[PDB]
């Protein structure tokens with residue numbers, strides 16, 4: 181059987197997909213009795229140079245040339261983008277074409293509507309390559325952005341300011357000139373949306389993820405956390421309780437003994453809680469060749485071509501920084517004991533001149549508003565995780 | 569239009585019982601969903617007079633494996649018996665008789681999986697052994713793992729609570745982690761089996777159990793741990809496979825791990841596999857071992873997979889990725905010497921004079937007239953060399969994460 185495919189996009193991932201198919205073509209014929217023909221490649225601009233170099237494939241700038249080709253069996257999309265890309269994929273599925281996508285901009289809303297449209301039209305939608313950082317899961321926590329983690333590691337290990345650490349990340353290639361997507365936690369929040377969809381089968385919106393970036397984390401925060409037994413990481417978290425997902429991305433104190441506390445520099449990790457023990461997956465972000473390899477894997481799966489469950493038969497902790505405090509640390513601790521609702525434990529630390537930090541274990545919600553209404557100036561509050 | 573899938577179970581221990589319960593509890597669902605009716609037609613047991621729960625008495629129990637192997641109505645054989653002989657021959661026969669085989673046999677090694685996988689492909693049927701391995705998975709060049717929960721638990725206890733090996737092992741016994749004869753754990757045999765398996769899955773190479781150079785943890789002392797600690801290292805029992813120049817070098821032994829390495833943080837009964845490759849970053853998988861219900865659940869999962877693809881990937885197939893063209897190691901040692909006269913400065917100076925070229929050397933007090941050295945960047949163990957220069961070498965552990 182000839183399997184006629186088209187590629188939408190030819191960047192590093194697209195080029196990699198092509199090379200992998202070329203290199204394995206004879207093997208795929210001999211083994212699976214399938215002949216993969218790349219009949220069209222959509223590119224934005226036919227003139228640009230590429231890792232493929234000058235090649236033998238038909239390049240087009242007109243997507244309709246691909247979407248109207250009824251001889252196509254499978255569309256491989258490596259273009260990125262939501263518009264017009266998602267509409268292209270909707271058309272392909274409506275035309276009874278299998279779709280494999282490595283589109284990093286897709287969110288849960290998009291994957292859901294594409295998965296349904298695929299099922300509806302009797303074809304496959306594969307998005308394995310779209311994720312890169314895969315059992316009743318109740319909670320996950322992750323370090324999901326390499327650049328922000330790199331910055332925090334640098335601040336921590338080398339005792340530099342955020343500004344110095346970000347400049348170093350810029351010169352080393354990790355951060356871009358406008359590093360907002362990394363530093364403000366947007367990239368991490370996207371991965372929290374995707375991870376929540378995969379873990380809980382629930383669709384949340386990007387703006388449902390309560391998000392704070394790292395630009396306000398200081399050495400003082402890091403060193404106070406250190407003395408209390410914690411590192412600071414930008415943590416993306418999803419908690420699935422009572423039919424609802426609470427999702428967030430924010431600077432978080434993590435107990436030094438926690439597996440996540442050791443994840444440094446540009447490495448990422450996803451820590452999954454469920455019943456069973458915890459599990460964790462650790463590694464850097466893929467990986468053009470890895471992404472390309474995952475696409476081709478999904479491709480062979482579809483070429484070799486529903487669900488899933490089976491037989492059954494928590495408080496929060498907080499790091500609070502308060503400024504303009506008159507009086508001693510002992511007095512502050514006593515006042516805090518008097519003000520707080522019932523909780524499990526409290527420790528206080530010096531933070532700066534007339535500033536103290538408290539870690540409070542076992543509250544239902546942030547004591548920020550409460551402490552504010554009692555007349556204190558709260559600088560900020562970070563969650564605390566890994567507490568045993 | 570419902571198709572009956574006739575299966576047999578070889579063995580009915582905790583895993584076998586769990587497999588049965590899971591199938592029972594999900595039977596209606598598997599019919600309604602996949603339009604498949606799973607019928608457990610035979611269960612092989614060692615002793616069929618033995619009293620069993622009521623649910624088991626509904627099934628046909630036999631002590632004669634041939635009754636199962638000769639039953640042409642069987643579609644799938646699920647083996648949860650364990651053992652190499654006669655168990656592997658049973659599975660060979662099943663495959664030759666065109667029966668799919670799902671196994672959770674914990675005694676299977678690479679030699680066995682290889683011959684069964686080939687025999688399966690050869691006969692147009694599936695061999696599934698997912699349940700035979702505990703989770704936590706292209707060009708992998710090296711892996712390092714903490715592969716035995718009990719030994720890791722013991723080392724964590726020694727380290728955190730400052731106990732001797734003997735005290736930590738007794739505690740592991742009392743707490744349920746170690747068994748009464750803990751040899752398989754403590755001597756690193758279990759870990760060596762997993763290194764054979766991990767090497768087969770990572771490198772597609774078959775090694776024998778006796779090719780794995782093995783040392784357990786029973787000789788690790790609190791002094792080793794505390795001296796390692798002061799030098800910046802933890803001690804773990806590490807199972808390692810290095811694939812260099814067509815050959816696998818495989819080992820299990822006490823190993824100093826830099827405290828900043830991801831493996832250093834893996835404590836208690838948790839396991840982890842750390843995987844290194846060209847040209848991607850390192851990866852690691854972390855979690856505890858199975859798990860009778862988990863093993864049983866994995867068997868049933870493999871079962872449904874074989875059911876779904878029943879009416880329809882060759883083991884020989886590997887995706888070539890030498891378009892890495894288009895897109896684009898030394899050893900370290902911890903050496904303990906005893907009966908050393910003279911100062912630590914003198915020991916360090918002598919080592920500097922006698923060692924071949926290396927990246928760094930640090931020395932520490934170990935005990936009375938005993939010193940330890942960590943040496944980074946040698947081509948091979950300096951043990952013989954140090955011995956011929958008149959030092960009593962107590963032992964040498966590899967050092968990783970440097």
Ligand SMILES: N[C@@H](CCCC[NH3+])C(=O)O
Pocket residue numbers: 786787788789962963
């Ligand atoms: N305390 C023992 C530990 C055994 C190490 C064996 N390699 C000794 O003196 O060697």
